[PDB]
Design a protein around this nucleic acid. Structure first.
Ligand SMILES: [Zn+2]
Lengths: 50, 50, 522, 49
DNA sequence: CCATGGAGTCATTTTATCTTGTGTCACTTACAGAAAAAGTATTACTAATATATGTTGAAAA
């Protein structure tokens, strides 16, 4: 979904890797995992099993 | 501080509601360590012990 | 707030000792209360886009690990400009960026615009322009001030090795503030002088690093830097004190930016200078730009690039302009003489060649002027002082902006003392705001002066009267080269034959849309 | 909304239904004043009652 | 006038719920795509800063 909005509107030549956008999109893996292990409750959105 | 700021000011931020935390308890106590330090987010922090 | 039912005591002390929690004034002995109560245990046009606003913000915000706090702070700013409807017609990125940027600037935390702008395609004139505009519509003034002392820390975290760097940091700082003291700090990017000091002290740290690795944090060029290296090398006690003892010499010497030295190589009482005046003149009849521009020596017509026809002339060294509607702009005018007079000359082309097009609607729009005071100046203090009326965005652009409504002009400020002025609607405004703010110039100094008369040279209306004002008087200003300023007929045919040679595709697809106007049927 | 289905929605009728509350855990069970709590230890030399 | 047969009529079973579960502390933590409004950026210019980028390059070592 991130790189999507890159490839929506093709003004000039857009590559520019859209990598450092992993930062902005990151850390839901990290900080979210913190919040998890501190919570005591695990939400698995693959199995919908909690 | 609790309300919505604007960039319009003159002098006094000087209003301070103070809530110094009392040590309650059924007996005397001592303070042998206090700590002035900061977390990742660059905001002052004090965690002390009795 | 309340007061005792009897003793009239206003001072209330709440005893928590015995775990009654009972509040009484030391003036009575009667509580005014028993057992204080305590607690226990998206469809909108704006607000949905506000959830978007924090979302994109909060997302892009801490990718830089900027404070969760400061983000919250900037959000309310996005709501502020949202109220002004500053948020309407521009790319949301440039907006959301600037929003955050004003906060960290106001909180003076270590990030840089050129630094922060990079998370996209930004040319940094994009965002810098945006931020500049929301400033035009926001009276937020002096708060965004900068020094390298912030940046150097965040730089060092990228510099690795050991902690001698920190020792070296203190090195650079004394260096830095001295370079601030030695007056070369001004007019250049904080990143540049930052990495400058960082290098110089690393060379003091007897290590081997590279300009590459420096601009890695700095994001400037190398030649950029070493121009500042030598910009130190030329200074006093540069190599003479460059040795050990951590530069015990704190002494100033002089303060001499390279700026006026360029006046040396090129080499009040000084009267300001007329650069150009923006006027405009209406013809009164809309007419074909193509057909009329077909015969001229000076013409350019390319609606693919720009609609109207380009008027330009070597005499009296002017340009002006034309429109399609039968109007034009008058440009290249240092005074009113060459302004209205040449303005009448351009009408001799049309009234000679093209349609009726009298001389109507001559009005000044902008006026430009420049000057120099021949001494270095401290701009930051003025921004530190008049920043209410002044705008200085350090290296966002070297020219300092001043804002005066009386008279209404933006002022162009420099350490060099070269000072430029435009946006003026009147020649007297020049000396008005000019020598009005000159006591600010001579006011701000470190360690001629007479205005003479407020007005001397004749007014604008004098030189406007020096020109024939009657639209029907025409041939009087005809140079007889305006007879020549038209190309011959074959030049119009064959030349035009070439221009249409390319443009028959432009006008082609034009006529193709005009044909789609038939397709309006089906 | 948020669409997470937190659980926390009922509790008006359920307010006076089960556990600690209005049913018979708060009203029939009222929490009391003028009291104290400690642990135990003997005194035979203390009289009965 | 009686007989079989049908049609109503009413017992009756076996399903598929809905409630509740001894009382007490320690701290307690919306959905995507549409049409419109609109205002902004180019897109021209002079027109003067002094960085910044570059490249190149040419000259000098
Ligand atoms: Zn009282």
């Amino acid at each position: 979904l991130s790189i999507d909005k890159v490839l929506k509107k093709p003004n000039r030549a857009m590559e520019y890797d859209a990598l450092l956008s992993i930062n902005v999109h990151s850390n839901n893996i990290t900080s979210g995992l913190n919040r998890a292990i501190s919570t005591g409750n695990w939400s698995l959105k693959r199995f919908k099993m909690e | 501080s609790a309300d919505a700021p604007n960039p319009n000011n003159v002098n006094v931020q000087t209003q301070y509601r103070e809530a110094p935390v009392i040590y309650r308890g059924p007996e005397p106590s001592h303070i042998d360590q206090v700590m002035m330090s900061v977390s990742d987010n660059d905001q002052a922090l004090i965690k002390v012990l009795l | 707030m309340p007061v005792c039912k009897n003793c009239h005591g206003t001072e209330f002390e709440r005893d928590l000792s015995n775990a009654n929690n009972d509040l009484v004034c030391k003036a009575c002995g009667v509580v005014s209360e028993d057992n204080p109560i305590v607690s226990e245990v998206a469809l909108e046009s704006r607000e949905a886009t506000l959830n978007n606003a924090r979302r994109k913000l909060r997302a892009v915000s801490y990718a830089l690990h900027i404070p969760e706090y400061i983000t919250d702070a900037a959000f309310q700013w996005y709501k502020l400009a949202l109220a002004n409807n500053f948020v309407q017609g521009r790319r949301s990125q440039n907006v959301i960026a600037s929003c955050l940027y004003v906060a960290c600037r106001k909180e003076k935390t270590h990030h840089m615009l050129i630094d922060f702008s990079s998370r996209l395609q930004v040319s940094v004139y994009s965002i810098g322009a945006t931020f500049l505009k929301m400033v035009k519509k926001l009276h937020i003034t002096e708060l965004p001030l900068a020094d390298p002392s912030l940046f150097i820390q965040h730089f060092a975290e990228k510099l690795d090795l050991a902690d001698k760097k920190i020792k070296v940091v203190k090195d650079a700082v004394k260096l830095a503030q001295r370079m601030s003291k030695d007056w070369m700090f001004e007019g250049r990017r904080p990143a540049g002088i930052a990495g400058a000091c960082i290098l110089l002290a690393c060379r003091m740290n007897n290590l081997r690093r590279t300009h590459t690795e420096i601009v890695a944090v700095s994001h400037v060029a190398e030649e950029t830097l070493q121009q500042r290296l030598n910009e130190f090398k030329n200074t006093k006690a540069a190599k003479l004190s460059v040795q050990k003892f951590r530069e015990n010499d704190v002494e100033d010497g002089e303060a001499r930016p390279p700026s006026f030295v360029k006046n040396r190589k090129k080499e009040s009482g000084i009267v300001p200078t007329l650069q150009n005046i923006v006027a405009t003149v209406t013809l009164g009849c809309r007419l074909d730009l193509k057909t009329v521009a077909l015969h001229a020596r000076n013409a350019e017509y390319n609606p693919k690039r720009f609609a109207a026809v380009i008027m330009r002339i070597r005499e009296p060294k002017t340009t002006a302009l034309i429109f399609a509607s039968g109007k034009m702009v008058v440009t290249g005018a240092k005074s009113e003489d060459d302004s209205k007079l040449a303005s009448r000359k351009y009408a001799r082309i049309i009234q000679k060649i093209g349609f009726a097009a009298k001389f109507t609607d001559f009005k000044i729009q902008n006026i430009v002027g420049s000057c120099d005071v021949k001494f270095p100046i401290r701009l930051e203090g003025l921004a530190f002082s008049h920043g209410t009326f002044s705008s200085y965005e350090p290296e966002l652009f070297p020219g300092l902006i001043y804002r005066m409504v009386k008279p209404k002009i933006v002022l162009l400020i420099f350490v060099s003392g070269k000072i430029v002025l435009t946006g003026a609607k009147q020649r007297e405004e020049i000396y008005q705001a000019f020598e009005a703010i000159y006591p600010v110039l001579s006011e701000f100094r470190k360690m001629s002066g007479s205005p003479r008369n407020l007005h001397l040279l004749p007014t604008t209306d004098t030189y406007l009267s020096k020109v024939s004002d009657d639209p029907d008087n025409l041939e009087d200003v005809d140079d007889e080269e305006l007879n020549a300023h038209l190309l011959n007929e074959e030049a119009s045919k064959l030349k035009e034959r070439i221009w249409i040679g390319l443009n028959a595709d432009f006008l082609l697809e034009q006529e193709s849309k005009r044909l789609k106007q038939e397709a309006d049927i089906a | 909304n948020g669409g997470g289905k937190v659980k926390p929605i009922r509790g008006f009728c359920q307010r006076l239904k089960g556990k600690q509350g209005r049913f018979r855990g708060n009203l029939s069970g009222k929490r009391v004043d003028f009291s104290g709590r400690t642990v135990i230890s003997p005194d035979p030399n203390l009289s009965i009652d």
